[PDB]
Write a protein that binds this ligand. Structure first.
Ligand SMILES: *[C@@H]1O[C@H](CO)[C@@H](O[C@@H]2O[C@H](CO)[C@@H](O[C@@H]3O[C@H](CO)[C@@H](O)[C@H](O)[C@@H]3O)[C@H](O)[C@H]2NC(C)=O)[C@H](O)[C@H]1NC(C)=O
Ligand SMILES: *[C@@H]1O[C@H](CO)[C@@H](O[C@@H]2O[C@H](CO)[C@@H](O[C@@H]3O[C@H](CO)[C@@H](O)[C@H](O)[C@@H]3O)[C@H](O)[C@H]2NC(C)=O)[C@H](O)[C@H]1NC(C)=O
Ligand SMILES: *[C@@H]1O[C@H](CO)[C@@H](O)[C@H](O)[C@H]1NC(C)=O
Lengths: 49, 49
């Protein structure tokens, strides 16, 4: 709806915003989303992971 | 002086349910707290372990 400048959320985390120059809505997503796991065989064993 | 003795039998099948396990979860502090903020990350590091 009009008269809106920010996009809120249930957790009060911004996700959308209106560009004041192009008058169109954008989207915000954190640079890191997924989870990363690393498997190692031990320090003495080797260093490859 | 009396006694009761059964003369017939029946076969019955019953069910029983027992939980064995639940879901597994993980939590990241640097993302749940101080989401995308270098100053807040430094403050959290200063806070302690
Ligand atoms: C400053 O904000 C104003 C509104 O207050 C914006 O005005 C818009 O200016 C742009 C400049 O690119 C105009 O787009 C142009 O329109 C025609 C389409 O045929 C053409 O000349 C270009 O291809 C371009 O797309 C736009 O029409 C205009 N809006 C109006 C007149 O209602 C403006 O975006 C901002 N000024 C800047 C970025 O310099
Ligand atoms: C006490 O136990 C006796 C066996 O030691 C049971 O007698 C027999 O029970 C079977 C159960 O399948 C009866 O079969 C059924 O009979 C009729 C035939 O028209 C029909 O309902 C079914 O198609 C099936 O074949 C069998 O007739 C029966 N025999 C007699 C002589 O009654 C007896 O049922 C047990 N008592 C109770 C209260 O369950
Ligand atoms: C790693 O290897 C060395 C090689 O002698 C051994 O003495 C040491 O106990 C090992 N370290 C661990 C933590 O197992």
């Amino acid at each position: 709806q009009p008269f809106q400048q920010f996009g809120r959320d249930s957790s009060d985390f911004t996700d959308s915003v209106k560009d004041p120059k192009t008058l169109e809505i954008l989207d915000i997503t954190p640079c890191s989303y997924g989870g990363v796991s690393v498997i190692t065989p031990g320090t003495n064993t080797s260093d490859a992971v | 002086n009396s006694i009761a003795i059964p003369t017939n039998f029946s076969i019955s099948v019953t069910t029983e349910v027992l939980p064995v396990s639940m879901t597994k979860t993980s939590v990241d502090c640097n993302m749940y707290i101080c989401g995308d903020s270098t100053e807040c990350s430094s403050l959290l590091l200063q806070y302690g372990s």
